[PDB]
Design a protein around this nucleic acid. Structure first.
Lengths: 143, 55, 129, 175, 150, 218
RNA sequence: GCGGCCCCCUGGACGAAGACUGACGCUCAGGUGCGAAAGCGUGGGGAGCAAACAGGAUUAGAUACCCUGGUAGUCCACGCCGUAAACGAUGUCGACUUGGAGGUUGUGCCCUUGAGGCGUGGCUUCCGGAGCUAACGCGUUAAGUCGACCGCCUGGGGAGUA
């Protein structure tokens, strides 16, 4: 996280001072509200944590979607003890092995390396995480 | 990697048709790609893994 | 293998002058300190310093007059493949006297001026131009 | 003597502020360029000035000079009274240039050198001797001089400085 | 007091679309007669334009030489491209006795009585370039004594 | 005079070994210039640069990268001095001859522009001519009132403006450069190890230089 | 030159700390050894491929390219041959001389707070500085700066032939 001040604002480009060898440049996409305007001015002390970085402060635009069960896309990449970490829009998800691993009938190797579409019901902005549902198994397994 | 009897691990490092995956894909530093491949081949001799998917 | 440590010394000084090196270290010996004392005496190096106890290390602080380097061309004359022993009459002057030639005479390691004045020739080690 | 500077302790404090261990200590041989001479004026610079000044002397371009009377010229924007002062001899030349016997090409170079010298040395008035000729230096040189931006005015020199065989030239100098 | 002289004029060619096109190259050396030697190449479509560009380039790009009384100081070897060149001061070793294209640069250089012998290639464009390099890295007894203290 | 406040060095990438005497060089892969070496260097540059500025000389600030503009226009124009802020034309010092007649065309076209016949005879060609004044005005901007080739040169980046340094070395003009750790002290007579691409650093930096150019005994 | 996997016999290299010998080193004419492929000898083997060969085409012709077959050979054991654009067209050994990005294989230190950070070796790839070079390029693995020893060159052809 970096705390900087806005000094130069030329349409489509915002210049923030941090104190390194160069001053960062932030695209207006991070400072734009839901109405279609800006929310800052020259002389304002804003926050900026570094387009593979603007997502950290762009997920705030996906709240109005998770309020009505917004279907998204992700892929498993991490695995521990009964816990699965999925990269959903760049947010680690939680999937217990309650149904993932139980009563093995055959070669259950279709887990590590699967790329389907999952559904979300509840989101946690307090733990910067998004736990996946359970009943949505009827869509991810065989869509 | 060092071991060949753990065919869960070996089965991750192999494609759907029995072929060894390149380290260009899976990361796997070259020492462990060599141990890996040699372990895959020892496992294919024991019929723990398949040589192909048309046996 | 190392078979001519003197030419190795002069190589260290040519490549130190050529790389604007401030100082040059090498393994040390009696003959290298004799030559180095002649070079300091004649003004081609700034100083030398032999350190170490069991493995001595000669260190030559080099000279640079302007941006240019002082030691313009140092050559090894009496190499091991073919040794060159001149008399007091055959004893050469380098750059028509503007540049000494370090000759090992029986009285010690001298220059060409000093050994032609001493009246005795010897084994001509190196041209410093 | 060492120049006034922040205290060594202050420098250490700056080092302390430096995040991390934050110290660089690479040691390498250092070479320092020799200080430029106060006099300066290298021959190459002089040659360059000469070339720059002579660049204005075109053989194809002929400024309209007064055909009636002694040769004279005043640059647009300069007081016409300056040419009159030259004629009366109010100006005493500090530099003298003799062109007689030179080829046109040599003369142009020398003229350029003269103008460069006047500027460098803050000489405002110079005398140019071209001799007498038909379709020669006597005629071509005034035309070349007019084309030069630093030439303010010139007039046929008084008898004391060569008369009809010479020109007094006023040169614009930064003071 | 300029003392200019031309060494070599040649006809080079280009070979365009319709036939060939022939150009002329001069190679001159100027010098005052007391150090101060320059050479210039210059090339143009006719011969007098070529020599004039050569003189005009040679009047600038002029180098100092530390002469002796009327001659060189110590024997010096200058090399350029394929052209290796020896010179020997010849302390009043009368007359400039140098090869072609070296006699000229040594003549306008102001030296009078050296001994030369060019080796290797003896292309005139590279045998000067191997005389100036040569006369440039020849230093005087007040320069060597300046360097090494005394 | 004031201690360099906020730049502390930069350029992790393409660093140059000839900048090895000037580097403290620790943090996070990036190189830190030893500013305890910069302060005597920069005070020397102010010393000789004030020395030629007091002899009534011309200085020519060089500011092609952004945002050295309009900071070089502000700093050069705060003095009675000259600048290049857009693309430095290859050869405005070493053939200033030809650049003299381009400056002459800029003067004749602005005199023709705001006073004389600008609305005369055409609209399209008049628009053509005005945008010739934009092109000749932003390229030959500061240098248009010089009338000589200058007595010093002050460049703001040594590798980005290597052409101007190469020409001022070709002509015997003292080059005053703020080098960074990627740059090379070519023929820069008065090197200053600093930071080339921080606007705080170049406004502080040109502030000091423009301060000492017009410094007056009064 | 060596490419599945396993066993047996075996050579070298490199790294870490310490101990030991104490110049035992470097190069090398003659000499000796190893030396792709094709080839040769004796005895096996022979699936594929394939000089030769045969047929079909193509073509003016086609003793070729293309097609269909196809023997020696390629494979094994032992012996011979002794050569290649056997090539980094770059002899071996040692020393010194600015840099950058990698690869590969060791090792030490630090919160290992991970797929890290800092070093220190061995081998190797690409680009480049000075320098060198006819140029092209080489460029700490030199074609730079030196030393030791060896091999070889001296216009093209005839001729690497008699």
């Amino acid at each position: 996280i970096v705390r900087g001040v806005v000094v130069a604002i030329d349409k489509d480009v915002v210049l923030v001072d941090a104190g390194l060898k160069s001053e960062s440049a932030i695209p207006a996409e991070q400072f734009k509200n839901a109405q279609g305007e800006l929310e800052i001015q020259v002389g304002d002390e804003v926050d900026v944590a570094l387009e593979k970085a603007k997502r950290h402060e762009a997920w705030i635009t996906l709240e109005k979607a998770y309020e009505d069960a917004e279907t998204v896309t992700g892929v498993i990449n991490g695995k521990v003890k009964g816990g699965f970490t999925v990269e959903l829009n760049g947010i680690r998800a939680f999937l217990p092995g309650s149904l993932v691993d139980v009563r093995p009938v055959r070669d259950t190797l279709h887990l590590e390396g699967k790329e389907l579409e999952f559904k979300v019901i509840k989101l946690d902005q307090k733990r910067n995480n998004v736990v996946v549902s359970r009943r949505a198994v009827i869509e991810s397994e065989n869509s | 990697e060092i071991d060949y009897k753990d065919i869960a691990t070996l089965k991750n490092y192999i494609t759907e048709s029995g072929k060894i995956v390149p380290s260009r894909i899976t990361g796997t530093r070259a020492k462990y790609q060599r141990q890996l491949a040699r372990a895959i081949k020892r496992a294919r001799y024991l019929s723990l893994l398949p040589y192909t998917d048309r046996h | 293998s190392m078979q001519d440590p003197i030419a190795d010394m002069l190589t260290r000084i040519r490549n130190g002058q050529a790389a604007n090196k401030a100082a040059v270290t090498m393994p040390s010996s009696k003959l290298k300190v004799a030559i180095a004392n002649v070079l300091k005496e004649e003004g081609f190096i700034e100083d030398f310093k032999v350190e170490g106890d069991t493995k001595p290390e000669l260190e030559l602080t080099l000279k640079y007059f302007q941006g240019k380097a002082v030691v313009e061309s140092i050559q090894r004359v009496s190499r091991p493949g073919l040794r060159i022993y001149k008399r007091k009459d055959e004893l050469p002057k380098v750059m028509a006297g503007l540049g000494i030639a370090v000759v090992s005479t029986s009285k010690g390691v001298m220059t060409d001026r000093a050994a032609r004045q001493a009246g005795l020739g010897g084994e001509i080690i190196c041209y410093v131009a | 003597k060492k120049k006034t500077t922040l205290s060594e302790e202050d420098q250490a404090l700056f080092r302390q502020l430096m995040a991390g261990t934050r110290k660089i200590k690479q040691d390498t041989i250092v070479h320092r360029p020799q200080r430029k001479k106060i006099s300066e004026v290298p021959v190459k610079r002089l040659i360059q000035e000469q070339a720059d000044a002579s660049h204005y002397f075109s053989d194809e371009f002929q400024p309209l000079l007064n055909t009636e009377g002694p040769v004279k010229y005043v640059r647009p924007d300069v007081s016409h009274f300056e040419a009159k002062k030259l004629r009366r001899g109010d100006y005493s030349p500090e530099l003298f240039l003799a062109l007689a016997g030179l080829t046109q090409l040599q003369a142009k170079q020398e003229l350029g050198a003269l103008i460069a010298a006047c500027r460098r040395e803050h000489v405002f008035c110079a005398c140019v001797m071209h001799g007498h000729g038909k379709h020669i230096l006597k005629q071509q040189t005034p035309l070349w001089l007019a084309q030069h931006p630093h030439v303010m005015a010139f007039h046929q020199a008084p008898k004391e400085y060569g008369g009809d065989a010479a020109l007094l030239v006023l040169i614009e100098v930064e003071e | 007091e300029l003392q200019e002289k031309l060494i070599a004029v040649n006809r080079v060619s280009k070979t365009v679309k319709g036939g060939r096109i022939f150009s002329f190259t001069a190679l001159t050396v100027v010098g005052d007669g007391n150090g101060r030697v320059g050479f210039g190449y210059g090339k143009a479509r006719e011969v007098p334009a070529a020599i004039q560009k050569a003189m005009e380039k040679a009047r600038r790009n002029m180098i100092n030489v530390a002469l002796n009384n009327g001659t060189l100081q110590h024997p010096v070897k200058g090399v350029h491209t394929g052209s290796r060149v020896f010179m020997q001061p010849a302390s009043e070793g009368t007359g400039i006795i140098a090869g072609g294209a070296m006699r000229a640069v040594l003549e306008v250089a102001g030296v009078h009585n050296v001994l030369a012998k060019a080796y290797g290639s003896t292309n005139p464009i590279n045998v000067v370039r191997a005389t100036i390099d040569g006369l440039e890295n020849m230093n005087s007894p007040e320069m060597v004594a300046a360097k090494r203290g005394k | 005079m004031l201690k360099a406040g906020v730049h502390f060095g930069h350029q992790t990438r393409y660093w140059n070994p000839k900048m090895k005497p000037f580097i403290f060089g620790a943090r996070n892969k990036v190189h830190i210039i030893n500013l305890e070496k910069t302060v005597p260097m920069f005070n020397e540059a102010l010393a000789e640069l004030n020395k030629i500025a007091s002899r009534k000389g011309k200085i020519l600030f060089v500011g092609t990268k952004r945002a050295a503009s309009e900071a070089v226009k502000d700093a050069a124009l705060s003095c009675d001095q000259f600048f290049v802020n857009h693309r430095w034309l290859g050869g405005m010092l070493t053939n200033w001859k030809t650049v003299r007649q381009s400056i002459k065309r800029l003067k004749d076209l602005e005199t023709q522009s705001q006073d004389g016949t600008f609305d005369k005879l055409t609209k399209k060609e008049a628009l053509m001519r005005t945008r010739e004044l934009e092109k000749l005005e932003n390229s030959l901007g500061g240098i248009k009132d010089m009338g000589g080739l200058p007595d010093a040169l002050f460049v703001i980046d040594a590798d980005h403006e290597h052409i101007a340094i190469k020409e001022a070395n070709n002509l015997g003009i003292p080059v005053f450069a703020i080098v960074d750790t990627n740059s090379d002290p070519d023929g820069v007579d008065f090197v200053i190890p600093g930071n080339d691409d921080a606007i705080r650093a170049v406004t502080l930096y040109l502030g000091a230089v423009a301060a000492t150019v017009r410094e007056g005994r009064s």
